[PDB]
Design an enzyme around this catalytic site. Sequence first.
Site, PDB file in Angstrom:
ATOM      1  N   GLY A   8       0.914  -1.231   0.166  1.00 60.14           N
ATOM      2  CA  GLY A   8      -0.055  -0.046  -0.079  1.00 60.14           C
ATOM      3  C   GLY A   8       0.900   1.129   0.078  1.00 60.14           C
ATOM      4  N   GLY A  10       3.278   1.777  -2.597  1.00 58.19           N
ATOM      5  CA  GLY A  10       3.582   1.891  -3.825  1.00 58.19           C
ATOM      6  C   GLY A  10       2.903   3.006  -4.671  1.00 58.19           C
ATOM      7  N   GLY A  13      -0.845   1.462  -4.617  1.00 59.82           N
ATOM      8  CA  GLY A  13      -1.275   1.664  -2.955  1.00 59.82           C
ATOM      9  C   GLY A  13      -1.730   2.886  -2.751  1.00 59.82           C
ATOM     10  N   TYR A 136       9.237 -11.966 -14.446  1.00 59.98           N
ATOM     11  CA  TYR A 136       8.082 -11.114 -13.969  1.00 59.98           C
ATOM     12  C   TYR A 136       6.799 -11.646 -14.419  1.00 59.98           C
ATOM     13  CZ  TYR A 136       4.941  -7.038 -13.376  1.00 59.98           C
ATOM     14  OH  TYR A 136       3.981  -6.348 -13.100  1.00 59.98           O
ATOM     15  N   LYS A 140       3.421 -13.569 -12.522  1.00 63.30           N
ATOM     16  CA  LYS A 140       2.139 -12.917 -12.405  1.00 63.30           C
ATOM     17  C   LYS A 140       1.364 -13.945 -13.086  1.00 63.30           C
ATOM     18  CE  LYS A 140       3.133  -9.156 -10.462  1.00 63.30           C
ATOM     19  NZ  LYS A 140       2.424  -8.440  -9.401  1.00 63.30           N
ATOM     20  N   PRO A 163      -3.893  -4.512 -15.154  1.00 58.76           N
ATOM     21  CA  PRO A 163      -3.673  -3.199 -15.843  1.00 58.76           C
ATOM     22  C   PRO A 163      -2.595  -2.849 -16.926  1.00 58.76           C
ATOM     23  CG  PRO A 163      -2.738  -3.258 -13.503  1.00 58.76           C
ATOM     24  CD  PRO A 163      -3.190  -4.817 -14.025  1.00 58.76           C
ATOM     25  N   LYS A 187      13.961  12.723 -16.062  1.00 57.60           N
ATOM     26  CA  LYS A 187      15.004  13.115 -17.189  1.00 57.60           C
ATOM     27  C   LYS A 187      14.754  14.741 -17.738  1.00 57.60           C
ATOM     28  CE  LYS A 187      16.312   9.023 -19.734  1.00 57.60           C
ATOM     29  NZ  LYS A 187      15.617   8.160 -20.991  1.00 57.60           N
ATOM     30  N   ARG A 208       2.201   2.047 -26.354  1.00 56.37           N
ATOM     31  CA  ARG A 208       1.635   1.912 -25.132  1.00 56.37           C
ATOM     32  C   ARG A 208       0.627   2.289 -24.792  1.00 56.37           C
ATOM     33  NH1 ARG A 208       5.266  -1.340 -25.574  1.00 56.37           N
ATOM     34  NH2 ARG A 208       7.490  -1.341 -24.514  1.00 56.37           N
ATOM     35  N   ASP A 270      14.123  -1.411 -26.920  1.00 59.29           N
ATOM     36  CA  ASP A 270      12.817  -0.704 -26.969  1.00 59.29           C
ATOM     37  C   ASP A 270      11.596  -1.667 -26.408  1.00 59.29           C
ATOM     38  OD1 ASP A 270      12.695   1.679 -28.656  1.00 59.29           O
ATOM     39  OD2 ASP A 270      12.799   0.444 -30.747  1.00 59.29           O
TER      40      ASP A 270
HETATM   41  N1  LIG Z   1       3.354   0.565 -12.390  1.00 63.32           N
HETATM   42  C1  LIG Z   1       2.804   0.051 -13.491  1.00 63.32           C
HETATM   43  O1  LIG Z   1       3.072   0.723 -14.577  1.00 63.32           O
HETATM   44  C2  LIG Z   1       2.225  -1.383 -13.342  1.00 63.32           C
HETATM   45  C3  LIG Z   1       1.833  -1.758 -14.661  1.00 63.32           C
HETATM   46  C4  LIG Z   1       1.152  -3.087 -14.651  1.00 63.32           C
HETATM   47  C5  LIG Z   1       0.896  -3.924 -13.140  1.00 63.32           C
HETATM   48  N2  LIG Z   1       1.293  -3.049 -12.177  1.00 63.32           N
HETATM   49  C6  LIG Z   1       0.972  -3.792 -10.789  1.00 63.32           C
HETATM   50  O2  LIG Z   1       1.091  -2.878  -9.819  1.00 63.32           O
HETATM   51  C7  LIG Z   1       1.183  -3.325  -8.431  1.00 63.32           C
HETATM   52  C8  LIG Z   1       1.965  -2.517  -7.556  1.00 63.32           C
HETATM   53  O3  LIG Z   1       3.155  -1.970  -8.239  1.00 63.32           O
HETATM   54  P1  LIG Z   1       3.577  -0.081  -8.262  1.00 63.32           P
HETATM   55  O4  LIG Z   1       3.489   0.108  -9.619  1.00 63.32           O
HETATM   56  O5  LIG Z   1       2.707   0.305  -7.315  1.00 63.32           O
HETATM   57  O6  LIG Z   1       5.125  -0.456  -7.623  1.00 63.32           O
HETATM   58  P2  LIG Z   1       5.630   0.020  -6.165  1.00 63.32           P
HETATM   59  O7  LIG Z   1       5.430   1.486  -6.361  1.00 63.32           O
HETATM   60  O8  LIG Z   1       7.017  -0.191  -6.217  1.00 63.32           O
HETATM   61  O9  LIG Z   1       5.252  -0.336  -4.964  1.00 63.32           O
HETATM   62  C9  LIG Z   1       5.485  -1.931  -4.700  1.00 63.32           C
HETATM   63  C10 LIG Z   1       4.977  -1.891  -3.337  1.00 63.32           C
HETATM   64  O10 LIG Z   1       5.458  -3.250  -2.770  1.00 63.32           O
HETATM   65  C11 LIG Z   1       5.873  -3.381  -1.464  1.00 63.32           C
HETATM   66  N3  LIG Z   1       6.822  -4.530  -1.447  1.00 63.32           N
HETATM   67  C12 LIG Z   1       7.812  -4.826  -2.020  1.00 63.32           C
HETATM   68  N4  LIG Z   1       8.471  -5.995  -1.469  1.00 63.32           N
HETATM   69  C13 LIG Z   1       7.660  -6.239  -0.552  1.00 63.32           C
HETATM   70  C14 LIG Z   1       7.713  -7.327   0.347  1.00 63.32           C
HETATM   71  N5  LIG Z   1       8.851  -8.429   0.405  1.00 63.32           N
HETATM   72  N6  LIG Z   1       6.837  -7.656   1.398  1.00 63.32           N
HETATM   73  C15 LIG Z   1       5.716  -6.741   1.411  1.00 63.32           C
HETATM   74  N7  LIG Z   1       5.606  -5.557   0.448  1.00 63.32           N
HETATM   75  C16 LIG Z   1       6.484  -5.437  -0.257  1.00 63.32           C
HETATM   76  C17 LIG Z   1       6.605  -2.040  -1.409  1.00 63.32           C
HETATM   77  O11 LIG Z   1       6.882  -1.482  -0.121  1.00 63.32           O
HETATM   78  P3  LIG Z   1       8.278  -0.775   0.248  1.00 63.32           P
HETATM   79  O12 LIG Z   1       8.472   0.561  -0.128  1.00 63.32           O
HETATM   80  O13 LIG Z   1       8.047  -0.753   1.818  1.00 63.32           O
HETATM   81  O14 LIG Z   1       9.200  -1.937  -0.158  1.00 63.32           O
HETATM   82  C18 LIG Z   1       5.632  -1.148  -2.266  1.00 63.32           C
HETATM   83  O15 LIG Z   1       4.449  -0.634  -1.379  1.00 63.32           O
HETATM   84  C19 LIG Z   1       2.229  -4.787  -8.864  1.00 63.32           C
HETATM   85  O16 LIG Z   1       1.522  -5.825  -8.219  1.00 63.32           O
HETATM   86  C20 LIG Z   1       2.316  -4.543 -10.264  1.00 63.32           C
HETATM   87  O17 LIG Z   1       2.347  -5.848 -10.773  1.00 63.32           O
HETATM   88  C21 LIG Z   1       2.052  -1.781 -12.170  1.00 63.32           C
HETATM   89  N1  LIG Z   2      12.525   2.675 -18.599  1.00 59.98           N
HETATM   90  C1  LIG Z   2      12.360   3.640 -19.464  1.00 59.98           C
HETATM   91  N2  LIG Z   2      11.927   3.603 -20.623  1.00 59.98           N
HETATM   92  C2  LIG Z   2      12.040   4.610 -21.542  1.00 59.98           C
HETATM   93  C3  LIG Z   2      12.750   5.671 -21.194  1.00 59.98           C
HETATM   94  N3  LIG Z   2      12.694   6.800 -22.493  1.00 59.98           N
HETATM   95  C4  LIG Z   2      12.148   5.767 -23.151  1.00 59.98           C
HETATM   96  N4  LIG Z   2      11.764   4.483 -22.679  1.00 59.98           N
HETATM   97  C5  LIG Z   2      11.072   3.497 -23.691  1.00 59.98           C
HETATM   98  O1  LIG Z   2      10.379   3.024 -23.004  1.00 59.98           O
HETATM   99  C6  LIG Z   2      10.012   1.401 -23.168  1.00 59.98           C
HETATM  100  C7  LIG Z   2      10.109   0.753 -21.639  1.00 59.98           C
HETATM  101  O2  LIG Z   2       9.130   1.296 -20.884  1.00 59.98           O
HETATM  102  P1  LIG Z   2       8.928   0.369 -19.453  1.00 59.98           P
HETATM  103  O3  LIG Z   2       7.890   1.413 -18.899  1.00 59.98           O
HETATM  104  O4  LIG Z   2      10.339   0.635 -18.604  1.00 59.98           O
HETATM  105  O5  LIG Z   2       8.415  -1.023 -19.819  1.00 59.98           O
HETATM  106  P2  LIG Z   2       7.616  -1.897 -20.605  1.00 59.98           P
HETATM  107  O6  LIG Z   2       6.389  -0.907 -20.858  1.00 59.98           O
HETATM  108  O7  LIG Z   2       7.448  -3.151 -20.108  1.00 59.98           O
HETATM  109  O8  LIG Z   2       8.284  -1.994 -22.133  1.00 59.98           O
HETATM  110  C8  LIG Z   2      11.106   1.131 -24.409  1.00 59.98           C
HETATM  111  O9  LIG Z   2      10.344   1.230 -25.336  1.00 59.98           O
HETATM  112  C9  LIG Z   2      12.110   2.513 -24.094  1.00 59.98           C
HETATM  113  O10 LIG Z   2      12.672   2.623 -25.214  1.00 59.98           O
HETATM  114  C10 LIG Z   2      13.210   6.046 -19.724  1.00 59.98           C
HETATM  115  O11 LIG Z   2      13.763   6.948 -19.475  1.00 59.98           O
HETATM  116  N5  LIG Z   2      13.049   4.849 -18.995  1.00 59.98           N
END
Ligand SMILES: NC(=O)c1ccc[n+]([C@@H]2O[C@H](COP(=O)([O-])OP(=O)(O)OC[C@H]3O[C@@H](n4cnc5c(N)ncnc54)[C@H](OP(=O)(O)O)[C@@H]3O)[C@@H](O)[C@H]2O)c1
Ligand SMILES: Nc1nc2c(ncn2[C@@H]2O[C@H](COP(=O)(O)OP(=O)(O)O)[C@@H](O)[C@H]2O)c(=O)[nH]1
Length: 308
Positions: A8, A10, A13, A136, A140, A163, A187, A208, A270
Amino acid sequence: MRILVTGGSGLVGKAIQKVVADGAGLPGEDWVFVSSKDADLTDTAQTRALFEKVQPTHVIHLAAMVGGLFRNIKYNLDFWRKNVHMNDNVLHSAFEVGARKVVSCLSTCIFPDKTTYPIDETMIHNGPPHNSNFGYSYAKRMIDVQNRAYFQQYGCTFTAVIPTNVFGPHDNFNIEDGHVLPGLIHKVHLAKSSGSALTVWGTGNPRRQFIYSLDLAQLFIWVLREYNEVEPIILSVGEEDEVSIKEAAEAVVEAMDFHGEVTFDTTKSDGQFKKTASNSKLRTYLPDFRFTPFKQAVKETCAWFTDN
Ligand SMILES: NC(=O)c1ccc[n+]([C@@H]2O[C@H](COP(=O)([O-])OP(=O)(O)OC[C@H]3O[C@@H](n4cnc5c(N)ncnc54)[C@H](OP(=O)(O)O)[C@@H]3O)[C@@H](O)[C@H]2O)c1
Ligand SMILES: Nc1nc2c(ncn2[C@@H]2O[C@H](COP(=O)(O)OP(=O)(O)O)[C@@H](O)[C@H]2O)c(=O)[nH]1
């Protein structure tokens, strides 16, 4: 009701935390947001103790090892092992405590690399995922496998949500280990301070679908309250609302009012070029749900990064 929200602290969260606090929590709901400090979810004993002390009826499982493209390409063993441990400990602890519903979180990057477009909730296991994030992706994918196993053997309403690339406040803005949108926000900020040009990685051609963290937070609260299916549901924007990295970088450059040069590091990976998801299952359930316009949500995220 007693809702235990794992991970929660993150991006997703804090978004659910903000939505609930802004007036979304219905009367008779106890929202418990935990992090790694509350219990290391890779540890079976620590997780069992958390689920025993906080006895929940509903579970929102977000705790996972999450990173950008370049982090996944580096540590696929860690992304596989750490997530499988966290997922098994949370799902089985919720089972022995007798949780009525468990909504886990998946991703659109877990889908097969060689597939037909748009992707749907039935194509989840129809071929191997991309080589960059296979660790990963399979971790999942095994959430859905476990969800099916609990449901078919015990009748558990263990489901999941899928998502797209999420963005918003309380994101990981580490350019090296972070995603595309928070990594480009930091950046442009450094480029403004240093007087240097913006270097976008890759070619800028990969497409994306982006979802605002606050929007997915509202959909997540709905999924836990009315979505009774065991099969997952894609929580994303429409197929038509898919954008390229060039277009996404342009939105960040405009929101941060960057007037400097924008160059492309063609040498950088990419990753997966496309992963177009279909939100047809979401639109059959919520046809009246309105998403935050991408440019407005990018500006709000950029403003939060410069403020906090
Ligand atoms: N972000 C995206 O673009 C995206 C896309 C698709 C799916 N998701 C899904 O979104 C969910 C949340 O990700 P997020 O983007 O919010 O990333 P995040 O900001 O890095 O959050 C991850 C969370 O997991 C906790 N955590 C990590 N290791 C743990 C452990 N061993 N025990 C308990 N808690 C732990 C972290 O707590 P601490 O800081 O305390 O370690 C943090 O609150 C994931 O399940 C991911 O698959 C995200
Ligand atoms: N992580 C990351 N990706 C970038 C950045 N600038 C451009 N990209 C592009 O974004 C894509 C990766 O996005 P990312 O969110 O890390 O993951 P993905 O969606 O799983 O592929 C690639 O096509 C990269 O070329 C940057 O600063 N960070």
